[PDB]
């Protein structure tokens, strides 16, 4: 969580860092809402956010709630990508009707799925997201 906060709060606007910072706010919330607020406000209208490991890795309500609130007029009133593998799909998920209002519906559907999949606890979701990151960043530890 400290590493995610360092990567997100810095001058960079990494989609992985923002998703991790929002997801790492599942450990401390609503007491530790500062990290979630910074992740939500920083990536409210990011646009160029190459992310493909946020839909399944994040299972807490807050992570999807930040994106859902950003989709409204209280989070910049802009379009965003919320489909699975959105970073790679951006070539085929360009600006359309589904990226502003349909994106909000997709975020609602993802939140509904997380509610249905609420059996995955904070520890289980954290372990699964760490495993997915380790698979992705196995040769990118540097």
């Amino acid at each position: 969580l400290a590493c995610f906060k360092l990567r997100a709060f810095t001058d960079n606007r990494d989609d992985m860092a923002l998703g991790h910072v929002i997801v790492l706010l599942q450990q401390e919330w609503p007491r530790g809402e500062n990290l979630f607020l910074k992740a939500v406000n920083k990536i409210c209208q990011q646009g160029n956010f190459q992310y493909e490991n946020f839909f399944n890795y994040v299972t807490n309500i807050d992570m999807l709630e930040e994106f859902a609130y950003l989709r409204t007029q209280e989070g910049g009133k802009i379009h965003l990508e919320l489909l699975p593998n959105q970073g790679m799909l951006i070539k085929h998920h360009t600006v359309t009707r589904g990226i502003t209002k349909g994106v909000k519906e997709d975020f609602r559907l993802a939140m509904e799925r997380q509610v249905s999949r609420c059996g995955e606890n904070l520890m289980v979701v954290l372990h699964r997201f760490c495993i997915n990151e380790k698979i992705l960043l196995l040769q990118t530890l540097t």
């Binding site: 406000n41 609130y69 007029q73 209280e74 609420c118």
Partner: protein, 258 residues
């Protein structure tokens, strides 16, 4: 009439703490159960129409004057999301749509329906909605609307979460600016739809009691029986006023020009 505020908001498209009520989306929870927006009219206020509209920023209303709670359930289930989030504005729009659809002069009862979890800063919805302490040139604003209704923002969660999100604080400030539009947020913990139903259950103010009574008028062939309780008025306070009951009897005495 009836007023229903279906929170079709992008902010109101996520769970409260961990998961939704009926283990699914807000639409599933709405289908499973609802607030007192329709139960009171179904039980007591029978002569009332409802405008099933799901809207945040614009009057996306398709339901005309009708008492069908199925349409309200479908609209609430259809309140997926939108491009706005503002509780007071949603309440104002719901009241306006209900007045324009169910009846202009028919009273209704609207409430605030939004998530409000935007965060204090550049996107706070209370700043752009609670605007009443200035603008003397435009004092004749939409607030208060031309209909008796107390917009209430629901609150059933922890005190720390309610204070951090500034839900209860903004609701109380809006109530104070609107002079009582909203009950005291005396609720905490994992509470079901009881505080919301209590705050939205004030739409049954025009009920009636289908009872009967009798009277005795001696041994005449033309008697009389008292009617139900009348409407109280300022005539004689005496010790204290109270609602009337079934009167014992009257007496037919006197004869004057018709």
């Amino acid at each position: 009439p009836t007023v229903v505020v279906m929170d079709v908001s992008l902010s109101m498209t996520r769970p409260v703490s961990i998961e939704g009520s009926e283990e699914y989306q807000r639409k599933h929870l709405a289908a499973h159960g609802l607030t007192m927006l329709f139960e009171h009219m179904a039980t007591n206020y029978k002569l009332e129409f409802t405008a099933l509209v799901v809207f945040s920023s614009l009057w996306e209303l398709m339901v005309p004057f009708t008492r069908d709670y199925n349409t309200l359930q479908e609209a609430l289930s259809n309140m997926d999301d939108y491009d706005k989030t503002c509780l007071e504005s949603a309440l104002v729009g719901v009241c306006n749509i209900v007045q324009q659809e169910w009846g202009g002069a028919i009273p209704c009862q609207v409430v605030l329906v939004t998530d409000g979890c935007l965060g204090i800063g550049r996107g706070s919805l209370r700043h752009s909605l609670a605007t009443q302490n200035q603008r003397s040139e435009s004092n004749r604003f939409p607030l208060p609307f031309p209909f008796p209704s107390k917009l209430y923002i629901m609150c059933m969660a922890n005190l720390e979460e309610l204070q951090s999100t500034d839900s209860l604080e903004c609701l109380e400030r809006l109530i104070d600016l609107n002079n009582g539009e909203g009950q005291i947020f005396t609720i905490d913990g994992p509470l079901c739809l009881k505080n919301v139903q209590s705050m939205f259950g004030k739409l049954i103010d025009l009920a009636y009691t289908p009872f009967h009574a009798v009277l005795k008028c001696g041994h005449l062939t033309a008697d009389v029986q008292v009617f139900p309780r009348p409407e109280p008025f300022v005539v004689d306070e005496e010790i204290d006023p109270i609602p009337k009951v079934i009167n014992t009897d009257l007496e037919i005495v006197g004869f004057i020009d018709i």
